Amino acid sequence: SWQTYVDEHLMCDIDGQGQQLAASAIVGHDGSVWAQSSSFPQFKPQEITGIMKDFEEPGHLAPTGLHLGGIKYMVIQGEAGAVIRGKKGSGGITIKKTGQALVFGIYEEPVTPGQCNMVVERLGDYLIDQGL
């Protein structure tokens, strides 16, 4: 199906298989969902607007926190205009910007930052190399 293909060939695939602890998504710059893991949260349009703004001005979200699905993440050091990172509890969030889209990964213990980040980098490079 489309969603098994998404869960298998694209989104964070942490053992379970697909245990609820890790989730990822590809979201257009305009806030439309291109693909998301079965566990990925619903999010609000203005959360995407604020994230896009932080890619233009890194640290835009730091005083208020970064919100996704209503959850507040503390902004940490990222890569200006390319990657946003945030922490919450035992996990966090990584967002990579591509030409037309954003790649999200959300993780919690025992999923590690490195595990999630490897998937987010992989999907972002795949999109960028397709021209997206």
Author numbering: 2 to 133
Q: What do the authors say?
A:
Bet v 2 is a plant profilin panallergen, i.e., it is ubiquitously distributed throughout nature and shares a highly conserved amino acid sequence of up to 75% even between distantly-related organisms. Additionally to its ability to bind actin, profilins also interact with poly-l-proline and phosphoinositides. In this study, we present crystal structures of Bet v 2 in the reduced (without disulfide bridge) and the oxidized (with disulfide bridge) states at a resolution of 2.0 and 1.7 Å respectively. The reduced and oxidized structures were determined at a high resolution of 2.0 Å and 1.7 Å, respectively. Both structures share a central six-stranded antiparallel β-sheet with two N- and the C-terminal α-helices flanking the sheet at one side and a third helix flanking the sheet on the opposite side.
